Structures are given as structure tokens and as C-alpha cells.
């Protein structure tokens, strides 16, 4: 069982496009009057989330420009600028935000469509400091649209997410925790497939198990309803 990264470029582009359409269907379900209400993400109204998804598309466009021109263009000018623009976007009227989402989506797709073969492997830097090939934007965008589709609070679920994306997320999140020395002894178990996703090593093992969608929702900090613990009590997972 392969990861998103092993997939051919065309299939990764399709998954990103599918996730975007999935996210857009959820946004379409939300009413303009509901933008000001809390999203499923603490501290963020739907407007904040909707703005963020658009600014992320724009940030990924920067990496693709960097890739195609060879001229360094970071995802965001600065952490402050990233936060400040999300703050600004969250104040915009609903239709303005729907237009921003639509246009930012369209522009990122064009960026991908016009990317040269060599540019796809050009090294760029993520906002988190990772050195990756430009093609990583296909994965990065997929994480955003498939997961934030759920955060919109309409009808999207982790169960809606293609397994290849869920498997890659389970591995990535636990790999991130491991790199940070987080989640000592904590191991996620995709019970149906008997696949373990360990974090940092510890003396007391705690196995949190469920279906793949269940452990990913859990690892993503979005709930424990789909998992159970080997100790009878599910701990709060390390942040992500």
C-alpha cells in the first residue's frame, strides 16, 4: 500500500482537484449567513477557515513560480503576514470570500498545468522549513482541501477521504511527532489492516486503534469518536 508520493504526477493532480471540488461542494452548502459562525476549528469562524484555504492556494502558487522561474518566492512573506491576511480575509463579506476561493483555486490549477517537467522536481521550501520538490504542492494542497472540507462543518467526513491520502496522513503525522520526540509510547493502529503508526519511543505503550479514517481524525486533533485505547482511556494526541 502505496503513499501519495509514489503516485504518478497525474494521479496526484487528480486527487488534489478531486479534494478541491469536494471542499467546494461543502462551501456551497454553507449559507452566507453562516460564515460568521464558529467553524469546527477552535478560534476560527468559517470566514477565517475559508480565507485560509484561499491564502494557502496563493502560497502554493508562489512555490510553483519559484519552481518554474528558479527565483526564490517563499510561501508567505512572514508568519505575521500570514496571520494578518487571514485576519483581514475573515472580515470580508461572504460573496467576496467565495470569489477569492474560486479565483485562488483557478490560479493554482493554471500554475500546475503550465509547470514544466523539470520544474516539478525543483527544490523549494515549505512554510514549516522542509526542503521538498515543487511537486510536494500537490500533496500539500490535498491535505488542506480534504481535511478543511470536514472543518467547514457541513457534511464532509474523514471517511470521504481517499485511502491513499489517509494512509499518507497517518504516516506523516506520526513521522512529524517522532521527529519532535512527541507521543512517547503512543502508537496508532489501523486495526482492519493491522498497520501500526508509532511515534516517539517510550516505556509505556498506549495503542489507539480504529479504522484508518478514525485514527487520522484522532491524530489530526479532530476527535476521538472513531478510536479506543488499549489502556481504556484515549489520551489527547500531540499537537498537529
Residues that bind Zn ion (CB under 5 A): 144
Shortest CB 194 distance to Zn ion, Å: 31
Known binding residue 10? Answer is: no
Q: Which residue number, 144 or 190, has a Cβ lying nearer to Zn ion? A: 144
Nearer to Zn ion, 50 or 187 (CB): 50
Q: How far is the CB of 233 from Zn ion (least distance, A)?
A: 29
Q: How far is CA 40 from the centre of its chain?
A: 15
Q: Following DSSP, what letter does each residue of 87-142 receive, concatenated?
A: HHHTTS-HHHHHHHHHHHHHHHHHHHHT--TGGGG-EEE-TTS-EEETTHHHHHHH
Q: Give the torsion sign (CA, 125, 61, 136, 240).
A: positive
For Zn ion, the closer CB: 75 or 187: 75
* 52 marked among binding-site residues: yes
What's the min distance (Å) between Cβ of 153 and Zn ion? 15
84 assigned ligand-binding residue: no
Task: State how far the Cα of 110 lies from the Cα of 194, in Å rounded to an integer.
Answer: 40
* Nearer of residues 85 and 144 to Zn ion, judged by Cβ: 144
Annotated binding-site members for Zn(2+): 52, 144, 148
Amino acid at each position: 500500500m502505496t503513499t501519495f508520493h509514489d503516485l504518478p504526477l497525474e494521479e496526484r493532480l487528480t486527487l488534489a482537484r478531486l479534494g478541491t471540488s469536494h471542499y467546494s461542494r461543502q462551501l456551497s452548502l454553507v449559507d452566507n449567513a453562516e460564515f460568521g459562525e464558529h467553524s469546527l476549528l477552535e478560534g476560527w469562524t468559517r470566514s477565517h477557515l475559508i480565507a485560509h484555504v484561499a491564502y494557502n492556494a496563493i502560497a502554493l502558487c508562489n512555490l510553483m513560480h519559484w519552481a518554474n522561474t528558479g527565483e526564490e518566492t517563499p510561501m508567505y512573506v512572514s508568519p505575521e503576514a500570514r496571520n494578518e491576511e487571514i485576519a483581514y480575509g475573515s472580515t470580508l463579506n461572504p460573496d467576496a470570500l467565495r470569489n477569492l476561493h474560486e479565483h485562488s483555486v483557478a490560479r493554482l490549477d493554471v500554475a500546475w498545468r503550465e509547470t514544466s517537467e523539470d520544474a516539478w522536481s525543483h527544490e523549494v521550501l515549505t512554510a514549516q522549513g522542509r526542503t521538498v520538490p515543487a511537486s510536494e504542492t500537490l500533496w500539500m494542497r490535498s491535505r488542506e482541501v480534504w481535511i478543511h472540507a470536514v472543518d467547514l462543518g457541513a457534511v464532509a467526513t474523514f471517511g470521504d477521504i481517499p485511502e491513499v491520502i489517509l494512509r499518507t496522513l497517518a504516516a506523516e503525522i506520526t513521522q512529524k511527532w517522532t521527529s519532535q520526540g512527541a507521543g512517547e509510547g503512543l502508537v496508532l493502529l489501523d486495526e482492519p489492516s493491522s498497520t501500526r503508526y508509532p511515534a516517539a519511543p517510550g516505556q509505556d505503550e498506549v495503542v489507539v486503534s480504529g479504522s484508518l479514517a478514525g485514527i487520522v481524525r484522532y491524530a489530526a486533533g479532530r476527535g476521538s469518536d472513531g478510536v479506543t485505547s488499549s489502556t481504556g482511556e484515549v489520551p489527547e494526541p500531540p499537537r498537529w
